[PDB]
Amino acid sequence: ASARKKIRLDRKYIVLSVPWDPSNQVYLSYNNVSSLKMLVAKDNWVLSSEISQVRLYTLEDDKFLSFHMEMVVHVDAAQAFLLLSDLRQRPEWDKHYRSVELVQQVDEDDAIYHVTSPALGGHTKPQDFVILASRRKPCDNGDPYVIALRSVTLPTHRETPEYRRGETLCSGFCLWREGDQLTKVSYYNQATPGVLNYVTTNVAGLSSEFYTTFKACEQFLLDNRNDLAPSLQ
Amino acid sequence: ERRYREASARKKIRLDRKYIVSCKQTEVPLSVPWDPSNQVYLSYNNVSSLKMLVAKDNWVLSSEISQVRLYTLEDDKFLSFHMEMVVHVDAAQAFLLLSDLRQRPEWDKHYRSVELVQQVDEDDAIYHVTSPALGGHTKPQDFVILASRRKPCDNGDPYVIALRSVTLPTHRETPEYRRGETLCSGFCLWREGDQLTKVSYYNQATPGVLNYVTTNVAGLSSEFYTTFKACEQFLLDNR
Ligand SMILES: [Cl-]
């Protein structure tokens, strides 16, 4: 199944950014967040695998092989929200984040980041991304905390030969409070063309780097479970 | 139209911040226990509450498209809204069609399914409704709703179809669905002539769907209008 499933997915899915403008920062931010929420609610998510109560789902759209991972972590959702919404700290737990640079603090809950990523799948250059991150605290009615990521273009931050400029359409974290010191943590990625080989390898079960990274995510949250620094920034 | 989109986006942020602390069951009777000994008053109160909501003086007209109107009331504990249009159907027939909650899934995508739980009397019934997951959720919602319908007492008065959440020992919350509550919703229908009816839908407080309400009210989405349009086409198809 594995090798064959991988090759089928590759054959199916082989071969996204929006211009940023200060005059539409509020709308772009809404759309960033709203897109992630809508992705969560799509009706055709299918469980691909489970390993140690951690679940990997896919959505095989006509355009995209979307995936998401879910786990339950013994950390407070508000704390998980501050820890995960600071993308500067993501290189610490996520190997796929080689570096992170804050381009533009847009407001309290929105920022543009320059992200670089190690090359994977034969490339002799790393990838880079210019990403709008938009975070929202929910109403206390059971809605999730949301940290939404989508690629944006800026006249000053176009691609240079140092990196393959990639794009991500709709990615990020949702966190649902499940109890005192219990959070359901999910990471979603709708479409990131430049890493499809890597996705299909993971989704088919030839690799478990997604599981490994999500384990390091949990450990990062637990290790920083009770840090005050996030809430005082 | 960038400017107008930016305004909408700002309005949603304002509203969301304003109601970020949801109204609780201790503060307002989002649901009430179903008590068959009190069935008469429970239905009376359901109708009277919707009549009072209608008569509130602080409704503000927030938008209009094709002479369909969306009003809002930014109350202190919750954000109430109501939609209003006039349809080329007899009020008496609209009354039968809109009181039949089991038919509501045919025109309202928010009603995924409806089960009649108890017919209390000719004009009052309790239903179990399921609703599709909105953005940010993976489980559908369910509700247990008392629907009480009344004809107009005098001329000028509306037909009233009042909905309010109730609880029952046979339909307690289950892990399969996120249980929602509605405080006071439903339809008022006024005769505007021969086969003209003013059709209004009201929703005082459904705290579980706040984000969806703010998106629509802010004008970033038009799903309220799309559903109300389908409502119209349902009524026209069923004359
Ligand atoms: Cl959910």
List the Cα angle B196/B191/B153 in 5-degree steps: 165
CA–centroid distance, B134 to ligand 1, in Å, is 9
Alpha helices in chain A (DSSP H): 2-13, 25-41, 77-85, 196-204, 209-223, 229-232
Tokens of residue B172, six digits: 């307690």
E-strand stretches of chain A: 18-19, 46-51, 54-60, 65-73, 99-107, 110-117, 127-136, 145-153, 164-165, 171-179, 182-189
Nearest to B6 among A27, A138, A140 (CB): A27
Beta bridge pairs of residue A51 = A54
CA–centroid distance, A51 to ligand 1, in Å, is 22
Tokens of residue A29, six digits: 């931010």
**Contact between residue A131 and residue A165 where contact means Cβ atoms under 8 Å apart:** no
List the Cα angle A84/A85/A86 in 5-degree steps: 90
- Inter-chain contact B178–A140, Cβ cutoff 8 Å? no
Nearest to A40 among B6, B21, B135 (CB): B135
Tokens of residue B90, six digits: 């007899």
CA distance A85 to B181: 32
Tokens of residue A12, six digits: 């199916």
Q: Is residue A69 helix, strand or coil?
A: strand
- Inter-chain contact B22–A139, Cβ cutoff 8 Å? yes
**Residue at token pair 């004008």:** B219
Q: What is the resolution of this structure in A?
A: 2.0
Q: Is residue B75 helix, strand or coil?
A: coil
Tell me how far CA of residue B3 lies from CA of A110, A122, B149, B217, in angstroms: 19, 45, 44, 17
Q: Could you give phi then psi for residue B163, rounded to 5 degrees?
A: -125, 135
CA atoms A175, A177, A180, A185: torsion sign? negative
Interface probe with B: pick from A20, A21, A34, most Cβ of B within 10 Å: A34
List the Cα angle B215/B219/B224 in 5-degree steps: 70
Q: B70: burial class by Cβ within 10 Å (0-12, 13-18, 19+)?
A: buried
CA distance B229 to B195: 18
**Contact between residue B63 and residue B70 where contact means Cβ atoms under 8 Å apart:** yes
CA atoms B58, B63, B65, B66: torsion sign? positive
CA of A144: which chain B residue's CA is closest? Answer: B136
Buried b (16+ CB within 10 A) or exposed e, B77-92: bbbbbbbbbbbebbbe
**Chain A residues within 8 A of B13 when measuring between CB atoms:** 26, 30
Tokens of residue B142, six digits: 């369910």
What domain count does chain A have? 1
Residue A173's contacts (CB-CB under 8 Å, 6 or more residues apart) are A84, A145, A146, A147, A185, A186, A187, A188
CA of A175: which chain B residue's CA is closest? Answer: B136
CATH number at residue A53: 3.30.530.20
CA distance B146 to A37: 31
**Contact between residue A168 and residue A150 where contact means Cβ atoms under 8 Å apart:** yes
CA of A143: which chain B residue's CA is closest? Answer: B136
CA distance B12 to B28: 24
CA distance B29 to B33: 10
Nearest to A139 among B3, B19, B133 (CB): B19
| Residues followed by a gap in chain A, C→N > 2.5 Å | 15
Tell how far CA A67 is from the center of its chain: 10
CA atoms A97, A102, A104, A108: torsion sign? positive
| Experimental technique behind these coordinates | X-ray
Nearest to B135 among A37, A137, A140 (CB): A37
Structural domain of A51: 1-233
Cβ < 5 A residues, ion ligand 1: B 137-139
- Inter-chain contact B136–A41, Cβ cutoff 8 Å? yes
Could you tell me the end-to-end alpha-carbon distance of chain B, in angstroms, rounded to an integer? 40
Nearest to B83 by CA among B231, B236, B228: B228
Interface probe with B: pick from A18, A137, A143, most Cβ of B within 10 Å: A143
Q: Categorise residue B136: left if φ over 0, alpha if ψ from -120 to 50, beta otherwise.
A: left
